[PDB]
Design a protein around this ligand. Structure first.
Ligand SMILES: *C(=O)/C=C/c1ccc(O)cc1
Length: 125
């Protein structure tokens, strides 16, 4: 695989500019969003957790279209506050339940190093 742990302190440096192939080698789900919530990257581990096909969801809006169960103050609200502030680093558990068996996960959202994009990392709990 790639040798990176979920929740690592410098994860934004390690994954900076990472190509889609390399991202598919992580042990955990990884999604890169723009500030509106459009999906830029979506790795294989995430697709295994959620059932989504990665190439099919890239370009869709995560909160509007893919993941309406996250369109809430507890997930999207945290995301949008962090985009607005230009700073985000939060970890919380959540349940994904849209057109799927409900699945409890740990989520880590963190602003990417450069530019203005945002990671959503996911693992099972
Ligand atoms: C709730 O609608 C969650 C859905 C979801 C979460 C994460 C994904 O990668 C895809 C769908």
């Amino acid at each position: 695989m790639e040798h990176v742990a979920f929740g690592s302190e410098d994860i934004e440096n390690t994954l900076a500019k990472m190509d889609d192939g390399q991202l598919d080698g992580l042990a955990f789900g990884a999604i890169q969003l723009d500030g509106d919530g459009n999906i830029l990257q979506y790795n294989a581990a995430e697709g295994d957790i959620t059932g989504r096909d990665p190439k099919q969801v890239i370009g869709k809006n995560f909160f509007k279209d893919v993941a309406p169960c996250t369109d809430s103050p507890e997930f999207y609200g945290k995301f949008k506050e962090g985009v607005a502030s230009g700073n985000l680093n939060t970890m919380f558990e959540y349940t994904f339940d849209y057109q799927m068996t409900p699945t409890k996960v740990k989520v880590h959202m963190k602003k990417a190093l450069s530019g203005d994009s945002y990671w959503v990392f996911v693992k099972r709990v």
